[PDB]
């Protein structure tokens, strides 16, 4: 029953989708972090941290 419902084609497609979705999430995280950092730059000067 299971391998009929969840076969190799569907599993492979689902996993490609998982990978692509979390890559997109990797991009979203990077951009979101760039912006989060750009928001607060006068409270954390690079010179002071160095």
């Amino acid at each position: 029953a299971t391998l009929k419902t969840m076969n190799l084609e569907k599993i492979s497609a689902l996993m490609d989708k998982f990978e692509h979705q979390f890559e997109t999430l990797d991009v979203q995280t990077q951009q979101m972090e760039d912006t989060m950092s750009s928001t607060t730059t006068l409270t954390t000067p690079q010179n002071q941290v160095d």
């Binding site: 607060t40 409270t43 954390t44 002071q48 941290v49």
Partner: protein, 50 residues
Amino acid sequence: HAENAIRQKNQAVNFLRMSARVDAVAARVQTAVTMGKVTKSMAGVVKSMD
């Protein structure tokens, strides 16, 4: 951790200055409230004495 420390230091200084400003404003407003009560009481006294 250096970024975190510098950020916390700067934001603590900012919060302190901000609290000082709000304290000044609140003291002024409290003075105004007390003086308004006093002025209302003296107006009532003036009316009654008149």
